[PDB]
Amino acid sequence: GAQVSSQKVGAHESTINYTTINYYRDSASNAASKQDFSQDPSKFTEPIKDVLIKTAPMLN
């Protein structure tokens, strides 16, 4: 049940890995993986009904 992932290596001394094993049945006990996803800001930065083209007039 071991889970192997790679570290994004900062200052160097192939890819380096680390190993994780979950000891508990409840997922709340698990540490945070930090393997997170990014999204694009559109829903906040451009919430407009008509798609905007930046080179064209915002208002036409």
Binding site: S42, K43, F44, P47, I48, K49
Partner: peptide, 28 residues
């Protein structure tokens, strides 16, 4: 054009000739 809209819901219609587009909150 972006500035001219007509909205209709039920027995009611709104017109506008000077809008600055529409916003859909959080894109939903």
């Amino acid at each position: 054009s972006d500035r001219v809209l007509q909205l209709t819901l039920g027995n009611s219609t709104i017109t506008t000739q000077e809008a600055a587009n529409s916003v859909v909150a959080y894109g939903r």
